[PDB]
Symmetry: D2
Subunit: 289 residues, 4 copies
């Protein structure tokens, strides 16, 4: 169980300086893992990353969100093939890094669709995801589909939909990824989805309802962490937060970050690392006696 921080706490540009900065600041805030947003994995400086991770003795993972030009839920096979080629490059980036986990909105575009998912689009997604999963299987990489809210996909809005999606592909390294931010909008409660997906849950995002400081919003973290403890979850737990103060050219506009929710990210990250770790410590004590 590694405790991680999403790279957009620190920078929005993952050039050499941004890779080095984020890795270092992640280590300084107390985390074990940095999660690299590979929005563009074709231009991600793997050498700078492997060097920075080794220096700070830190682990890496990667998340990603596709767009209109790379939508695998598209009925246009050229667009589905673009996304599958991007997803495959990211898996390659993770293999080069020696990392084990790939996750995110890799089953559709990460946007506000204006129509429902189509049956054919869903097949294209499932086929695509299955091929990525198989390719990732030979390289030692787990793939987790992130359930996100109605405004960021029209495909996987609940843990149950994710479970049905997986059940068709029945790939041994393909898992579900839950984000407390997204749960707090779409799910019926913060404990049933964790119980429901028990075996399939392989990646977790910790995010406040407005995506700022932990425990300054509407997200029921207590119920969540107690559920996680009950199914014996031992995957990554990764802080995630977005503010006007750290902008990415792509991601910040896709996630609708219009507001300043922090300025001092070194305080935000240290606090969050403390928040998650002490949540896990308290829950262990329900477990025993």
């Amino acid at each position: 169980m590694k405790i991680g921080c999403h790279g957009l706490v620190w920078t929005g540009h993952f050039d050499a300086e941004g890779i080095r900065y984020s890795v270092q600041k992640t280590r300084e805030a107390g985390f074990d893992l940095v999660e690299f947003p590979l929005m563009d994995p074709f231009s991600f400086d793997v050498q700078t990353a492997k060097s920075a991770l080794a220096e700070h003795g830190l682990a890496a993972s990667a998340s990603l969100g596709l767009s209109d030009a790379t939508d695998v839920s598209s009925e246009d096979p050229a667009v589905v093939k673009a996304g599958e080629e991007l997803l495959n490059r990211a898996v390659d980036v993770l293999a080069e890094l020696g990392a084990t986990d790939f996750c995110g909105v890799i089953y559709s575009a990460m946007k506000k669709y204006m129509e429902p998912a189509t049956a054919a689009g869903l097949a294209n997604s499932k086929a695509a995801v299955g091929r990525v999963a198989d390719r990732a299987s030979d390289l030692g990489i787990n793939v987790s589909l992130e359930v996100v809210n109605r405004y960021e996909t029209n495909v996987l809005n609940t843990g149950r939909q994710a479970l049905a999606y997986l059940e068709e592909l029945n790939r041994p390294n393909l898992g579900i990824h839950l984000d407390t931010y997204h749960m707090n909008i779409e799910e019926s409660d913060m404990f049933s989805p964790i119980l429901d997906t028990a075996e399939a849950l392989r990646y977790v995002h910790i995010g406040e309802s407005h995506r700022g400081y932990l425990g300054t919003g509407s997200v029921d973290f207590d119920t969540f962490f107690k559920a996680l403890g009950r199914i014996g979850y031992d995957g990554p737990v990764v802080f995630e937060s977005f503010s006007s103060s750290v902008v990415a050219p792509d991601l910040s506009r896709m996630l609708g970050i219009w507001r300043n929710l922090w300025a001092d990210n070194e305080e935000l990250g240290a606090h969050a690392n403390a928040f998650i770790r002490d949540k896990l410590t308290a829950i262990k004590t329900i477990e025993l006696h």
Copy 2:
């Protein structure tokens, strides 16, 4: 018999129908009273072709009050930098205010300060100035007709202007119009706000309209919204404006609104049970909170 007091318990029309032709108006007015509500809220996405006579007739027959909400779009975006786009929306808003006056309604609300969509760029100072100026004109027009206007705070995916009650407060202070007020929504508050009582307390004076929605917009009490704290806080400020249920499912589709609001999922089929559940939920909540000042 019409309920004459100010705190009316209302239903959003989209529990009942997506189409507000004459049958849709009649179906929703009837089903709304059959559920126990005092008021129906009409989604005037198009107020130019809204059958005002049918609405008058059905409201009188069933003895029901009405209000109207609305969300703009790209062609009607008042936060657009182009005075032609701005003035298209401004004509849209004006017709809605007129439709309400004909109905004898009091309350106009919704996302009327920008398009109701997923923006890709933060707001501009120029568009912000356009929204304020136009909203200031619509409020003026409404004031002569005995209509209040309430700006609905909604989540980051539905506007890039007013995402918190604090932003709305600041927006009103600039315009300083006596009939312009704030409209909060528990669904939206559950995303953007810090907690469910601070928005109520900060907004106290300006809170004129409230929407009751579960976190996923389904059945009340099957999601993650903290209704207890919200209602307790409403009772602490002695709120007595409208309180209106709001729910969307793929069962009942609007060609426009269902797609703008991202209703991909089926959350209920039986809307008679939904509306009846929600009426009791709101009214029993209000009944319980009243007992707290005594114990």
Copy 3:
């Protein structure tokens, strides 16, 4: 799944009039069932009750809390036998009434112990409770041990303790009774006790944190009812509230009811009926579509 009301919403005296009064009002507020507090089962008017239940078509159950003089968790076997004979008469009363459910603090005194439990006292309790369960069994009655808080017993304060207690007795009609008012104090959360006790959960009390109006205190009813949804619970669900305005000379003092929490019980009972039936109506829709 009958939805019940505790008798002290209506009266503190279960003489002929009290019995008739409590049965009438329970039905007028909309309940299916009235739970009689059998503080003194020897003097309970069974005939008036059977009369009143049939007149208003209402089901019945009974609850009870032992006192110092009847403490089956005593080391004094004369006290233990007084307690056993009182429990036995209560079981008898339920048989005559034609009821199925007996519940309450029947494994110890209901009081503020000034000493931890003794091993000798714990063994007295289990053996007495076992005999009452055996007796009850031949009359088709379930016996449900109510988990209460640290101030009302020193024996069974959590569902986990109740399960371990049951494990040693292995009686087929012995179950656990949970009260939200008590869980809100002693339990780690409102779902995990339900899931842990699912087999043996046979009776439920619905009470606010201060025992007044439902939804005017600190109890997490949402998580509670959703957990009951998860395990398929369909035993009795009974409203329980206490106020200065309805006094039971014994029970009001034992429970520490010092405050006015309601003056008009007719509104209170109607509200609590709607509240519970509406929680259940909504939870049913979570399960499927």
Copy 4:
């Protein structure tokens, strides 16, 4: 090392550490309280006559730690008794406790000081209440001249029959009208009696001068039913900057009288070093987090 300067002291109650406050327990508890990160230790002055003040003074200076004391009366000392002998025994127990604090150079005295801390079997009587009010009014006056604040702790129905809610406590103060007399709320007891976790804070605003952070069952924080989020948010909205003191009880750490009085029947923790550090970190992190809310 160095004494925390300001008023908002993050403290720890002594029964996290030990149940006996002879010289050894005082030293043990002060050292561990500083070790876990706290600014303050609250001594349970159940018996203030036999309290070793000079040892206390030593340990507090050595470890750079502030102090306060809490206390709960009993049958023999019930200042809400109608027997004036019993009220006097209480008033003289309270007075010595006042005195120990002044010797320590403390500022805060709190606890269940308006009655016995027990499960009463009868409602409060008008005569007892009269005794309680006048007697507390005197202990407050006496404490006033010494620079001591006196905070009445609101506790649940099973531990008193006088002050079970914030509103009751207000009406008690309004009748005494004493400047140094204040209210002490406890999230554990609030979780039972109050209407919610923010109204008692908003209602008590002025007179709120002491705060106990205890979980619903009184073990680790964040492993129970207490709504800490709303509570700390409400603290932030009123600008509260008094003490904030952790409080936990487990059968691993037993005081002869107190642990029985409070019904500590269960084992809720054993490694109290980790508990205190966890609790300290919990409170400071909560207060950090909530200070961000005004800005956003």
